[PDB]
Design a protein around this ligand. Structure first.
Ligand code: JE6
Ligand code: JE6
Lengths: 483, 483
């Protein structure tokens, strides 16, 4: 049983939810966590979704080495310096990302416009060795991801791909994980080092008021092509720099999903990614025809699987139905199906949905289409409720004086901004200081930073001033405390 | 074009075959190679096969960290000692294998016999940092693999799983990759450190006479359970050690496939793993109805894909058909389909098989079933020819005096052996010395070691003596030079 309340001690709630559901195990190296099958299966599902989608775009998978030489990297990094006891003459780094590993090869492979576009992806893990507090799934020292890297003859084609991938990330979060996200452009201070423009999808954790970057898609432009001499010839033979993109998304997505839909009973997993969509729990009275009940459960499982419903029967005789109900609730199975002698006699089954607890009596003949309908209802309900919480979590403001009250309500702020990079640094420092003072009156950082400049922009009145500098505002920008 | 001959300079042939087909790219860290899509797709195919098969056994995937603490590992390793410039207080190692990473968790997770069997697998890369000459695919410093790890209430159930997995590895090599392998038991000196009994499938490279371990499946017994205190209670409450297995297989399999089937024109890829099974090459005379020809090629592609045949049309107008024929031969596509105006007029297509060059004229209505039949014929032919070469490569001998002649014929030897571990060390040293002398008369190591003790044992006459010690022979053992 989960016993911390999600709305009272969120940190303890999260730990209990992911440990008691058997998703994670701890490890004696800080910032690294074991992903057990209950979590890993969800990763496999979103991996298959994204892989199928980028394959349709002509992206192909590959595998590049986990090590990068010092001079290539330096053209929060873990450095290998010894094999056994023998020092290496040049230290080598574990990849935090693979631009410097892949792009010398790109420079070799690309010669003609006929070689473009080049589109590669790899599924691997990377290491970003930071000393700040790690969080299971959300912010870890090693994490699983995919990184895609493309090169194009024109900036416009590269940008179109940046946005196509960002839309795939929106679908990963909203359509698979039922997590609402906001598409936007990163600030100059927050964009990828060396890139031209970084786009992002941002999510929100209401219980601690924090934004979090859900995935990222970078227009690198010609910057890395200049760095690595990646050029192509047109048909007349003139050499030009390629235009590049890089994009990535990680197991952070699972953590965001967990935090968005979980409740006081534990996990709630959206049906579209749940490894068990329906758990069948037979009633096993000592004084019943148990073989008949179990046989009917097997028949129902076969029937549901013909509709591609993922089913598990928990026929263990050493646990009670009440124990099983709690067990699979903690694990987030979206539907429970109960079958006992009285149901058998009626030709029906009792189905309980995990998100609301509502129960249904459903005839066996109706079971497959009704459960498909119910699972789409659960998926949409999880998304719509999360989207309403996202909406309620964003305050539209006009001046910096409104920031700290809004942050104290654990909200994000949407504010007109002049987009001066110095002003973002100053806002970060000032909000951190004010947060510290408030903490001392009270008995992760308190700084507010930009999350993104949203693609969907409210109207900007003619003389609207920047909320911090008073200079002419340029765009509406989303800010908050952040991971 | 490949221009080194496979039977004249095998090393150069192999390099040309894997580079000119765009399977590999070199890298500025020795022993690490980039896997380009043409190779990576084959890895994806065998990964899907093996993953589906172990899922049917109740194995579930997971992900454990790439780092292991020094004391846990030490309860050819690359050591991380710094993040940026900050030294760590305890150095941490990159996994060469994950027993010491996973089994503390196993000890925590396993409490009751009801928790058994526990069956986990992960797909990842590992690092074994050796200074010997590396070989693309076959012997690398970092390599992709899967490692499976199971725990059972009895030794017999664990052993049954060891053999079930070994059979899956036989299917991986023989049924997917059309590479014949020999199942056997490793010698005491060659078995997994800490394990009870190691089983193996061994393959053979005729051109350099070398055996190579294709995959491995270990009965760990209770040894690691003792090391890590992995115990379970029976229903009456007595604690007993679990019985464990570990097994692994790597991208080495791709290299073995390449070496087994390739020819002087380049790669030959078995249809069951070829990412392009049929390449359609339209004839594109300037004075023809090119749109009609290309339209028919599209129709044929759709028809073939309804039979799950993997098809690519090479409709590039800037290369000749002869250029395309060579291009896709070098890449190992098992079937080429040619279509020009005269074929269109006849309602047929011309199909050329990559392994033998035989051509067929096939009606469009017959195309799908005939090509399925032809691909199964190519697959079986590749396997049967490789199996005959394996058979011709093994000499059954009686005394050590016959070893060096057989090795000079680039053969393996099957010999009666007393199985004394000291005798294996002495045979290794003696054959290395004799090889060195022969080298100096002539203008990788020359040592002969055990490859395995095959499951399929010839009859052992009553008084048969060991070929090296003259003591009573115990079993027939397969020896050769080795990777
Ligand atoms: C699990 C996960 C995810 C991500 N990040 C980054 C942005 C990104 C996005 N979008 C990546 C480009 C794809 C993402 O997901 C980052 C991380 N760890 C770290 O920064 C290291 C760390 C560890 C402990 C505390 C503080 C920092 N850990
Ligand atoms: C690609 C690949 C494969 C394998 N091995 C091992 C046995 C095994 C089997 N069966 C593993 C258990 C699964 C296998 O495939 C091993 C390796 N590198 C190494 O030993 C490191 C190395 C590098 C250069 C020269 C010498 C040694 N490199």
């Amino acid at each position: 049983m989960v016993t911390a309340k999600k709305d009272e001690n969120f940190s303890e709630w999260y730990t209990q939810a992911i440990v008691r559901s058997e998703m994670i195990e701890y490890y004696d190296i800080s910032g690294c966590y074991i992903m057990r099958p209950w979590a890993f299966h969800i990763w496999e599902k979103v991996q298959r979704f994204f892989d199928d989608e980028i394959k349709k775009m002509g992206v192909e998978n590959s595998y590049f080495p986990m090590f990068v030489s010092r001079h290539k990297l330096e053209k929060e990094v873990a450095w290998v310096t010894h094999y056994g006891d023998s020092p290496l003459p040049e230290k080598i780094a574990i990849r935090p990302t693979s631009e410097t590993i892949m792009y010398p090869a790109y420079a070799k492979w690309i010669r003609s416009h006929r070689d473009l576009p080049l589109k590669l992806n790899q599924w691997c893990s990377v290491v970003r060795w930071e000393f700040k507090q790690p969080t299971p799934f959300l912010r870890t020292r090693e994490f699983l991801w995919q990184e895609g890297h493309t090169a194009h003859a024109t900036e416009e084609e590269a940008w179109e791909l940046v946005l196509d991938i960002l839309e795939l990330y929106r679908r990963w979060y909203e359509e698979c994980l039922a997590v609402p996200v906001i598409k936007g452009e990163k600030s100059e201070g927050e964009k990828f080092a060396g890139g031209k423009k970084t786009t992002t999808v941002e999510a929100f954790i209401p219980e601690n008021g924090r934004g979090i970057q859900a995935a990222t898609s970078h227009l690198l432009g010609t910057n890395f092509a200049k760095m690595f001499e990646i050029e192509f010839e047109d048909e007349e033979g003139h050499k030009r720099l390629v235009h590049q993109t890089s994009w990535g998304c990680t197991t952070r997505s699972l953590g965001v999903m967990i935090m968005t839909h979980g409740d006081d009973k534990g996990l709630v997993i959206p049906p579209r990614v749940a490894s068990v969509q329906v758990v069948i729990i037979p009633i096993l009275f000592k004084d019943e025809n148990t073989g008949e009940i179990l046989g009917k459960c097997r028949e129902l499982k076969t029937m549901l699987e013909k509709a591609d419903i993922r089913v598990r029967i928990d026929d263990r005789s050493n646990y009670t139905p009440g124990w099983k109900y709690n067990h699979w609730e903690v694990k987030g199975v979206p539907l429970r199906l109960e079958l006992g002698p009285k149901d058998l006699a009626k030709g029906t089954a009792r189905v309980v949905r995990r998100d609301t607890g509502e129960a249904y009596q459903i005839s066996w003949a109706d079971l497959a289409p009704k459960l498909l309908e119910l699972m789409e209802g659960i998926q949409r309900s999880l998304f719509e409720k999360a989207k309403a919480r996202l909406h309620e979590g964003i305050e539209k403001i006009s001046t910096f004086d409104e920031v700290m009250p809004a942050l104290n309500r654990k909200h994000l702020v949407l504010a007109p901004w002049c987009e001066d990079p110095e002003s973002e640094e100053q806002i970060k420092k000032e909000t951190q200081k004010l947060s510290e003072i408030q903490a001392i009156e009270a008995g992760m950082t308190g700084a507010m930073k930009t999350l993104c400049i949203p693609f969907d922009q409210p109207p900007m009145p003619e003389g609207t001033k920047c909320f911090y500098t008073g200079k002419p505002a340029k765009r509406w920008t989303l800010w908050g405390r952040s991971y």
